Design an enzyme around this catalytic site. Structure first.
Site, PDB file in Angstrom:
ATOM      1  N   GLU A   1      51.451  29.352  34.552  1.00  0.00           N
ATOM      2  CA  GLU A   1      51.010  30.231  33.482  1.00  0.00           C
ATOM      3  C   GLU A   1      51.653  29.885  32.160  1.00  0.00           C
ATOM      4  OE1 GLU A   1      48.578  32.250  33.341  1.00  0.00           O
ATOM      5  OE2 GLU A   1      48.153  32.724  35.431  1.00  0.00           O
TER       6      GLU A   1
ATOM      7  N   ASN B   1      42.369  34.401  23.513  1.00  0.00           N
ATOM      8  CA  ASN B   1      41.095  34.162  24.175  1.00  0.00           C
ATOM      9  C   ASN B   1      40.025  34.560  23.159  1.00  0.00           C
ATOM     10  OD1 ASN B   1      42.157  33.575  26.917  1.00  0.00           O
ATOM     11  ND2 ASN B   1      42.844  35.713  26.836  1.00  0.00           N
TER      12      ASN B   1
ATOM     13  N   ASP C   1      36.846  36.931  24.261  1.00  0.00           N
ATOM     14  CA  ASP C   1      36.880  38.377  24.393  1.00  0.00           C
ATOM     15  C   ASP C   1      37.885  39.068  23.484  1.00  0.00           C
ATOM     16  OD1 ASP C   1      39.288  37.897  25.681  1.00  0.00           O
ATOM     17  OD2 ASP C   1      38.615  38.523  27.655  1.00  0.00           O
TER      18      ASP C   1
ATOM     19  N   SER D   1      41.143  38.926  23.417  1.00  0.00           N
ATOM     20  CA  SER D   1      42.381  39.397  24.023  1.00  0.00           C
ATOM     21  C   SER D   1      43.390  38.251  23.944  1.00  0.00           C
ATOM     22  CB  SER D   1      42.133  39.799  25.476  1.00  0.00           C
ATOM     23  OG  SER D   1      41.844  38.659  26.259  1.00  0.00           O
TER      24      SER D   1
ATOM     25  N   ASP E   1      47.022  36.553  25.965  1.00  0.00           N
ATOM     26  CA  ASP E   1      47.925  36.530  27.125  1.00  0.00           C
ATOM     27  C   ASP E   1      49.345  36.313  26.588  1.00  0.00           C
ATOM     28  OD1 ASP E   1      45.718  36.609  28.935  1.00  0.00           O
ATOM     29  OD2 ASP E   1      45.445  34.461  28.563  1.00  0.00           O
TER      30      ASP E   1
ATOM     31  N   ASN F   1      47.699  39.849  30.100  1.00  0.00           N
ATOM     32  CA  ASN F   1      46.615  40.126  29.149  1.00  0.00           C
ATOM     33  C   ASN F   1      46.639  41.463  28.391  1.00  0.00           C
ATOM     34  OD1 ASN F   1      43.434  40.893  28.748  1.00  0.00           O
ATOM     35  ND2 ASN F   1      43.826  38.710  28.451  1.00  0.00           N
TER      36      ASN F   1
END
Length: 130
Positions: free
Chosen positions: A35, A46, A49, A51, A53, A60
């Site tokens: 990750e 992202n 959408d 959002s 991380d 998220n």
């Protein structure tokens, strides 16, 4: 902060992650590795959408932490996403535990399915004394 492999393993052990909801420490290590490369400052936007991380576990902003700029934010961890960019991972760990309390468990992170599931993950904790 970028953790060294065994340093992170012992830290996670102290924070009660070994066997949490049936998830072994090696599985948590494989997750953090893929990750973020064990980097607490890691962030990934992202565009699709809107959002982002955050942190070592790439949690998220739509469902778990609040950053104020994500549409349809739920903030299930009741945490500012800023808490997930600290060198101290106590908050990230508390939120990661919340994530896996949902039915999906660690499957929630796609990266776990792609690179850890059904694989030999012992290598991540070998030699760490945990």
């Amino acid at each position: 902060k970028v953790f060294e492999r065994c340093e992170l393993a012992r830290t996670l052990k102290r924070l009660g992650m070994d066997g949490y909801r049936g998830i072994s420490l090696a599985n948590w290590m494989c997750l953090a590795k893929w990750e973020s490369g064990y980097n607490t400052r890691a962030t990934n936007y992202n565009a699709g959408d809107r959002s982002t991380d955050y942190g070592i576990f790439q949690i998220n902003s739509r469902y778990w932490c609040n950053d104020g700029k994500t549409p349809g934010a739920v903030n299930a961890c009741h945490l500012s996403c800023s808490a997930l960019l600290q060198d101290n991972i106590a908050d990230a760990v508390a939120c990661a535990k919340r994530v896996v309390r949902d039915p999906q468990g660690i499957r929630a992170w796609v990266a776990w399915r792609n690179r850890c599931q059904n694989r030999d993950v012992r290598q991540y904790v070998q030699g760490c004394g945990v």
